[PDB]
Each structure stands twice: as structure tokens, then as C-alpha cells.
Design a protein around this ligand. Structure first.
Ligand SMILES: Nc1nc2c(ncn2[C@@H]2O[C@@H]3COP(=O)(O)O[C@H]3[C@H]2O)c(=O)[nH]1
Ligand SMILES: Nc1nc2c(ncn2[C@@H]2O[C@@H]3COP(=O)(O)O[C@H]3[C@H]2O)c(=O)[nH]1
Ligand SMILES: Nc1nc2c(ncn2[C@@H]2O[C@@H]3COP(=O)(O)O[C@H]3[C@H]2O)c(=O)[nH]1
Ligand SMILES: Nc1nc2c(ncn2[C@@H]2O[C@@H]3COP(=O)(O)O[C@H]3[C@H]2O)c(=O)[nH]1
Ligand SMILES: Nc1nc2c(ncn2[C@@H]2O[C@@H]3COP(=O)(O)O[C@H]3[C@H]2O)c(=O)[nH]1
Ligand SMILES: Nc1nc2c(ncn2[C@@H]2O[C@@H]3COP(=O)(O)O[C@H]3[C@H]2O)c(=O)[nH]1
Ligand SMILES: Nc1nc2c(ncn2[C@@H]2O[C@@H]3COP(=O)(O)O[C@H]3[C@H]2O)c(=O)[nH]1
Ligand SMILES: Nc1nc2c(ncn2[C@@H]2O[C@@H]3COP(=O)(O)O[C@H]3[C@H]2O)c(=O)[nH]1
Lengths: 193, 193, 193, 193
């Protein structure tokens, strides 16, 4: 753990930031708890390690680290393993906090999200909200037809998510375009209900 | 206060540069004062801190940091908080010196500006000068017309500004179509006199 | 050698990485081995240095550095000195392990490959496997017709390769268009066989 | 100045690179010498200093820094001074050596060059050499006709050049369409002689 050092070195930097801007005690509570959930004691340049290795090693390594997330992922557990690997290599780990608006209706959407751990409300205007939890995913609609978000999605609890940007989503469905209808169908169901 | 030391250390290399170049006394006094006024003893990797946090937190922090600018701005007076946040996250801090031309008539423009603090004169070939100060904005005409600057704008005092690029303007206005009218109105009234 | 130390220090970071993710013994051995072949005890910023020099110097160097690769290389010998220089400057060094799939049939190809040192099996579906080594190249067919990979290519031994992106490939034949044919020629004997 | 430090540190790193790849004594001499001419014992990060100041300061600094260059150029003689500034802020300093081909005929050009100090020979397949020096420029033809290099341009002496990319070139001219014609004039003159 020299990555224990970094966490502290970098959190010291954030306390001087909060100081300098005199953020209210609540806000500092949030920043601090987030930072704890997100880095969980440690900071490292994961991407620059993987950057140093071959593509196959990256793929092996990523598959190991994510075999749990995958088995617990309806859409991956079931799919061609190569599609899975390619999706996995493009996933960015993200944390959100109770009450956070992950997607705001009307926005232009740049990411879509996968639920590793957490619960989330999907709020459309005029109707009862619905929920999504571990295993599900949202935000694919705007990725399919560039466009304004169709619903707001608010974290109901701490959420550990993996995002996928619009470019990477496109890159992947270019690689595995047989997999686009699978997202289209889901978009479609969601849009009529 | 490593921020304090970073500021003495960075101004040292600026002291280096000025020397290796024989910068006239006048110039080097403008640079030093600029430096003092813009960094004010403190030099830190703020964007690097902000980048370690979630979007929701960047929003909460920015909204707090800027609550006084927002308060001083007729444009945000009665508006959707999300529109406001959206605007804030795309503004960039700038500082100009007495005498500086922030905008020249007849030029291609891709930036507008929101005055946080200071006083600016608006010059038009053939007319009386007017002035603008805390809370106002300028350079929206060009962003609307996509043509050229219809007037020059010169700082009368040290100005603390927040610029906003045309791409950013249009994106925000895409998400918040109703706010396009606010800018047209102010532009037109400005042009009707 | 100061950049012996680099290798030695960065690898310790690779060590913390494998520990943190509890990677299988076989995976760790594989990484240890890859990192050993790829860097040979020595890590330093190449890009950063060639970056500091003029283009003509960069070219004087790459030509010298790679004369033995060029010698080994049939397509180069009878080609323009300038074509050879322009290709070298776009080549990226990449290492594969025994067993690694370099190219997988059916994938979208964005790269082709020249073999400094390696042996590689070429496996077309339901018919006789073939090999390629030092001097040879593969992955050309795809960059030629912007379609899918017509064979898989697996690495028999450690493979020291120089890759070349589609954009880059395109760039160069658009400059020396005489030279496209050479690839087309080697592509077509391969397709009909 | 730790920029005398940087220089040594960065130059020590070139040496290790040179030893490592075992470059013939002549190649080493040219590297060594380029480096001395290009950096002249000092290494700092210009771009990041100017990067910490306002646009009007950059413009004042540059206009000073380049008054001889400007003085030296017929082009800039009776030019709208805001156009000179616009050109100036987009020039990148470059060094070349006796014998360097700055431009090879037939290549696809993406830059043009303004001679600060140096003599260059201009070679046309068939015709006789001519020479350009302090205060002249070359490379514009390709920029005006997004096409091939109509001539080679080799350096007779050490040259201190300022290059302008086609993007910046097309931007300055978008801003100043009048000026595209000063360039066409010379281009045509040079083509028809
Ligand atoms: N703790 C931590 N995780 C990171 C960092 N950068 C990327 N990650 C990844 O985010 C993942 C979150 O879940 P894990 O604890 O499995 O492993 C983590 C890493 O693979 C970092 O700086 N700290
Ligand atoms: N419109 C809509 N979106 C839903 C529903 N249930 C889940 N979602 C997700 O909420 C997301 C909000 O942003 P997108 O429009 O990008 O994609 C939407 C869907 O992925 C639903 O019933 N209607
Ligand atoms: N003083 C200072 N401010 C910075 C720096 N980098 C970014 N900033 C931001 O610029 C802002 C200027 O206005 P504030 O004083 O409100 O807060 C400042 C910071 O939010 C820096 O290096 N020094
Ligand atoms: N033309 C004009 N512009 C004004 C006036 N008062 C303020 N401005 C601002 O000055 C700006 C000059 O740049 P723009 O034409 O982009 O946008 C203009 C307006 O935002 C005015 O009375 N006339
Ligand atoms: N050791 C090392 N070599 C590199 C790197 N990037 C590019 N290279 C080059 O790739 C070359 C492969 O063969 P060599 O080991 O002879 O020399 C190597 C370097 O010139 C790097 O990060 N480390
Ligand atoms: N189709 C085919 N490709 C071959 C053969 N031998 C080598 N290759 C190479 O294998 C590569 C696989 O990827 P590509 O189809 O792009 O390009 C192919 C060729 O360069 C062969 O017998 N048939
Ligand atoms: N010494 C040095 N000069 C640089 C560097 N980057 C840009 N330059 C500029 O290159 C210019 C060459 O001519 P001058 O010596 O007048 O001024 C020099 C600097 O402004 C660098 O890294 N080191
Ligand atoms: N064709 C031509 N080019 C010249 C002559 N004198 C100078 N040049 C420069 O040489 C340059 C080579 O690159 P370009 O063709 O882009 O632009 C050309 C001119 O700017 C000349 O007499 N004929």
C-alpha cells in the first residue's frame, strides 16, 4: 500500500479545497463520505497499469475482476463472451449518493449505466415512479437516438455503477451489431409503458 | 498553504520568462499585477480535485461557490435551477486589466461573458459609449447571429469575468429551449437603442 | 541507465495491482513474463524524446533503429527510401505471448502487423492452418476493404511486432499511391488460397 | 532558473537514449547540436506560462517577442495589426539543420513556414534552385490548394523557422478573408515563373 499514501495525500488536498471555499458542514460530510465509498481507502493509476500490458492480458485481467458482475448481469451472463469482454473493457466504475440525480429528464445523454449495487428510481412526468436495482441498466434510450433524456433517474441509495459513454457504446455495437436489437427492444418496451 | 508556495514557485518561472525576453518595465508590471489579482497568493490544482468527485457533487459545490454571482444576475432571477446549474458547469473564469479589449467590433465571436465584478464600456463606431457591470452579460449577439461583433467592449476596471463558449451556449439552449428568448430579447433591446 | 529504475519501480506498482485483485497464479506469471519481454529491464519515455527533436532527426533515427527490420522486410527493399521512412514513423511496438489471439476471424480490423521476431499460426475456418514469421506481415486484407477479419492469427512464440493503424495506413498510400498494389497483390494471393 | 536544470536533466535523458540505441557518432553530433541550437541551454514550458495569463497579455508579450520577425516581413508591412497578432499567436518555433529537407515535393503539406533566420533552397524537378531567407515564407501553396507539394525545400544553414498549420491558416483567413489574396498572389507568382 503506497496507494494508501496517495489516498491520504489527495484527501489532504480536498480538505484545503473545502476550507478555502468554506463549504457548509453538510457538504463536507457528503464529499468526505463519497470519497470514502469511491476509493475505499486507496488511490491508484489502474488505467496506466493496464495501459502498459498487452490487449490480451487486459482482457484476461478484466474478465477475472468482473466475473461476479457478469454472472449477476442478465445481459452479459447470456451473451457471446467477446461482446462481454469488449463491453467490460470500456466500463468506468462510478459511485452515486442517496438522492443524487444520475440522469435528469430533458438533458442530452452522454453515458448509459450498469447497476452493480444499488437501487434507483425512474421518474417520468405525470406517473408513478418505478425502480431498477442490481443487474439492470438504464440510459440506453438516448444512446440509440441522440436525443434528450426521457426520464429522470435518481439514486435511492448508495449506488455502485459502471458507466459506458456514447462513443464506447457505438464502438461496441459496431464490433457486435447483432447486439443492437437487444437494446432497441428494451428501449422500445420502456417507451410505451 | 502549499497553495501559497505553489504561487511563489510558479511566479518565479514567470519572473524567469519575463527576463529571458527583456520585457519592458510597463509590461512586466502588467503581468505581475495580473498574477496577483488572478491568483491572489494561491495556486492549486482545483480542476484536478473537482474531477475526483461525482457530477452531483461538482454541481452542489459550484452552486454554493457561485450563489452570489447567481443572485446578482437578472438572467437567473426566476429560472429553473437545473438550467442554472447547467450554465454554471460550463463557465470559465477570466480576468482582464484596465484598458484591455475583451471584444473588438467586426471580429468573429465564439464567447460571451458574464460580469462577476467590474466595469466594462461598450463602444460602437458612431455612437455614445454605454457601460456594464456586476450581473450583466455581453457578447450574446454574435452567438445568436453567428456573424461578427457588433461593438467593442473594453474593461474600465479589473474585471472578474466568466466566459461561455458558443458550443456550450447552444448545448445549454438545446436542453432549455425557452431560455433562447431571454437572450434574443436582451440582444434586440441592445440593438433597438 | 536511470531507466533501469523506472522498470523496477513501475513493476512494483504492477505488483500491488495483482495483489489487490487477487489474480490467479497463472495470470500473475503471464504478466510478470510479459512485462519482462516487453521492457527487458528498461522503462523510459521514448515519445517524449523524439518529441523534442526535429522531424528529420526523428527520421534519421527510426531508419537506423529499424534498418535491420527493413532489411528483413521484402516490401521495403525495392521501395522508395521515403515511403519506408514514412511507414516506420507510424509503426507501434507491441508484444504478444504464446497463445494470444492477435486477430480473431470476424472482428472489425483497425490495424495491421509486421513481424520483427515471431512465429504466428494463421487459422482460416475449417481448413489447413499456416504460419508466418520474421519479415512477414498480416492483417492487410481488412485495412484494404474496411470489412471483417478473414482468418484468425494466433501467436506461437513470444511475438515482437510493429503495428500500423488503418488511418495511418490510409494516410501513407494516399501519399505514395504506387504502393497500394503491393499490399493488394499479397492480399489477393491470400484470399483466393 | 531550474530551466538550466531541466535542460541538463532532459539532455542527460537523450544521452541514455543515444547510448542505448548505439547511434553512430555523426547522428549523435547532429542530435547534440540541434538540441543546443533549439533549446540553447534552457528548457521551459512557454505554452503553460502564457497559458496562465490573459489573452491581451499573451498578445502583448508575443507582439513584443516578435517585433523583429514582424519588421522583417513584407507581408506584415501595412497589415491590419490585429491580423499580425492573430497570425503570431498561432506560430510554432522550429529549428532545422544544414541539409534537412523541411519539405519534400509530392508530399501532402499541412504547414507553412516563416523564416526568422536562415537560408533555404527551393528545388524544382527540372528547374534551377532558388533561395529564400530571413523574412520570407514558404509552404503556402499546399495550404491554399489542399494538394501536393510543388517543390522541395532544403535548409542551407541552421534555420530558425516559425510554422503555421493549415487549420490555423484557415482560421486566420476566415477572420481576415482580405488576406487570402496576398497569399494567392505569391503562390501564383511562384507557380508561373
Ligand atoms: N479503490 C480504488 N479503485 C479504483 C481506482 N481507480 C479505479 N478503480 C476501480 O474501481 C473498482 C471498484 O471496485 P473494486 O474495489 O472491485 O476495484 C476498483 C478498481 O478496479 C482507485 O483509485 N481506487
Ligand atoms: N422513458 C422511460 N425510461 C425508462 C423507463 N424505465 C427505465 N427507463 C430508463 O430511464 C432512462 C432515462 O434516460 P434515457 O431516455 O436515456 O433511457 C431511459 C431508460 O433507459 C420507462 O418506463 N420509461
Ligand atoms: N486562487 C486560485 N483560484 C483558482 C485556481 N485554479 C482554479 N481557481 C478557481 O478560480 C476561482 C476564482 O474565484 P474564487 O476565488 O471564487 O475561486 C477560485 C477557484 O474556484 C488557482 O490556482 N488559484
Ligand atoms: N450592438 C450593441 N451591443 C451591445 C450594446 N450594449 C451591450 N452590448 C453588448 O456588446 C456586445 C458586443 O459583442 P456582440 O455583438 O457579440 O454582443 C454585444 C452585446 O452583448 C449596444 O447598445 N449595442
Ligand atoms: N523499454 C521501452 N521501450 C520502448 C517504450 N516505448 C517504445 N519503445 C521502443 O520499442 C523498441 C523495441 O525494441 P528495443 O527493446 O530495442 O527498443 C525499444 C524502444 O526503442 C517503453 O516504454 N519502454
Ligand atoms: N484469408 C487469409 N488470410 C491470410 C492467409 N495467410 C495470412 N493471412 C493474413 O491473416 C490476416 C487476418 O486478418 P485480415 O483478414 O485482415 O488479413 C489477413 C492476412 O493478412 C490466408 O491463407 N488466407
Ligand atoms: N529555451 C527554450 N525555448 C523555448 C522552449 N519552448 C519554446 N521556446 C521558445 O523558442 C524561442 C526561440 O527564440 P528565443 O530564444 O527568442 O525564444 C524562445 C522561446 O520563447 C523550450 O522548451 N526551451
Ligand atoms: N512551385 C514553386 N514553389 C516555390 C517557388 N519558390 C518558393 N516556393 C515555395 O516552395 C513551396 C513548397 O511547398 P508548397 O508547394 O506548399 O509551396 C511552395 C512555395 O511556397 C517557386 O518558384 N515555385
Amino acid at each position: 500500500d503506497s496507494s494508501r499514501r496517495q489516498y491520504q495525500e489527495k484527501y489532504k488536498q480536498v480538505e484545503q479545497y473545502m476550507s478555502f471555499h468554506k463549504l457548509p458542514p453538510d457538504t463536507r460530510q457528503r464529499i468526505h463520505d463519497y470519497y470514502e465509498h469511491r476509493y475505499q481507502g486507496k488511490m491508484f493509476d489502474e488505467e496506466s497499469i493496464l495501459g502498459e500490458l498487452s490487449e490480451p492480458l487486459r482482457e484476461e485481467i478484466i474478465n477475472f475482476n468482473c466475473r461476479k458482475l457478469v454472472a449477476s448481469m442478465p445481459l452479459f451472463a447470456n451473451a457471446d463472451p467477446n461482446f462481454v469482454t469488449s463491453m467490460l473493457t470500456k466500463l468506468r466504475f462510478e459511485v452515486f449518493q442517496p438522492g443524487d440525480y444520475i440522469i435528469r429528464e430533458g438533458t442530452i445523454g452522454k453515458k448509459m449505466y450498469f447497476i452493480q449495487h444499488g437501487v434507483v428510481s425512474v421518474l417520468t412526468k405525470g406517473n408513478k415512479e418505478t425502480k431498477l436495482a442490481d443487474g439492470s441498466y438504464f440510459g440506453e434510450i438516448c444512446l440509440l437516438t441522440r436525443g434528450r433524456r426521457t426520464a429522470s433517474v435518481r439514486a435511492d441509495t448508495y449506488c455502485r455503477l459502471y458507466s459506458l459513454s456514447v462513443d464506447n457504446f457505438n464502438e461496441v455495437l459496431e464490433e457486435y451489431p447483432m447486439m443492437r436489437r437487444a437494446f432497441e427492444t428494451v428501449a422500445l418496451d420502456r417507451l410505451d409503458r
